[PDB]
């Protein structure tokens, strides 16, 4: 009964570091042939609040959106708990999110002092201190901006192509 259509069919998706969350308070998902990943956890796939989180990542990173994974995305951008209750859904979005010259508008967080807690969101852009000298908010050697653009081109390999992800947690 929940109106997921606004989430899955949204015209624009968030960068993974600034992942979007929508609060809502199931047969159409299986019959979709566009979904390339569909994995549910802690529930029989066949609820007070349901949270729909959505973002874009690269194809070879979709595996990190699962309980117990590691990598830049799971570590620094979007982290699921070990006891996750919900579903992860993804589909290739090369046709919407790639561009011949390259689409660079989607970002991910490249540096962080510690790993995200589950469902934590970090949208800060503090200069990252990679060495012993403090940075005082100034970019320079060992003092780095912490976000990095994806480079989505339609002729890249599928693992480098953009995927839209929706995480439904109950």
């Amino acid at each position, epitope marked *: 009964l929940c109106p997921f259509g606004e989430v899955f069919n949204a015209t624009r998706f968030a960068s993974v570091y*600034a992942w979007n969350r929508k609060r809502i308070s199931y047969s159409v998902l299986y019959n979709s042939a566009s979904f390339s990943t569909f994995k549910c956890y802690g529930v029989s796939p066949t609820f007070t609040n349901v949270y729909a989180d959505s973002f874009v990542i690269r194809g070879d990173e979709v595996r990190q959106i699962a309980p117990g994974q590691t990598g830049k995305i799971a570590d620094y951008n979007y982290k699921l708990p070990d006891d996750f209750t919900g579903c992860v859904i993804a589909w290739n979005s090369n046709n919407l999110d790639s561009k011949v010259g390259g689409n*660079y508008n989607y970002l991910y967080r490249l540096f962080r002092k510690s790993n995200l807690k589950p469902f934590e969101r970090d949208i800060s852009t503090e200069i990252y201190q990679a060495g012993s000298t403090p940075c005082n908010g100034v970019e320079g*050697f060992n003092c*780095y*901006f912490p976000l990095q*653009s994806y480079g989505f081109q339609p002729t890249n390999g599928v693992g480098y192509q953009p995927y839209r992800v929706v995480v439904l947690s109950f």
Partner: nanobody
Framework: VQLQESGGGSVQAGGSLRLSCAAS????????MAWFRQAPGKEREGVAG???????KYSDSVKGRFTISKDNAKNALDLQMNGLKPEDTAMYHC?????????????????????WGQGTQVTVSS
């Protein structure tokens, strides 16, 4: 967080253009930022870079003709292009946010800048 370039188009050889890259969620004043360009089927070239200290570097092909500067009123990075040549025809691309190395080599290392705009086409006709 994004960079948005504008100011490109068509111009006669010998003419002038000013590119601008408006930054959202990114403070240009304290940033390392650069302009690159790519002519079709050809290798990307760094044209002008600037560091937090206000120190600029130019490629040999544009020195004496281009000036890179920070606009802190609009929070944008500007590129003044004078004495334009058919040579200069290319997609011009702005990048910001040092993620590796030092700002002084970014013209040779575009991957050392994390955030990239969409590009703006400049076509110089003879």
């Amino acid at each position: 967080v994004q960079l948005q370039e504008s100011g490109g188009g068509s111009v006669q050889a010998g003419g002038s253009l000013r590119l601008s890259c408006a930054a959202s969620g990114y403070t240009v004043s304290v940033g390392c930022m650069a302009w690159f360009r790519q002519a079709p089927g050809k290798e990307r070239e760094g044209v002008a870079g600037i560091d937090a200290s206000g120190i600029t570097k130019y490629s040999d092909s544009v020195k004496g003709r281009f000036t890179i500067s920070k606009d802190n009123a609009k929070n944008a990075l500007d590129l003044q292009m004078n004495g334009l040549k058919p040579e200069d025809t290319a997609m011009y691309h702005c990048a910001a946010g040092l993620v590796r190395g030092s700002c002084t080599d970014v013209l040779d290392h575009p991957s050392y800048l994390g955030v990239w705009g969409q590009g703006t086409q400049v076509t110089v006709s003879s």
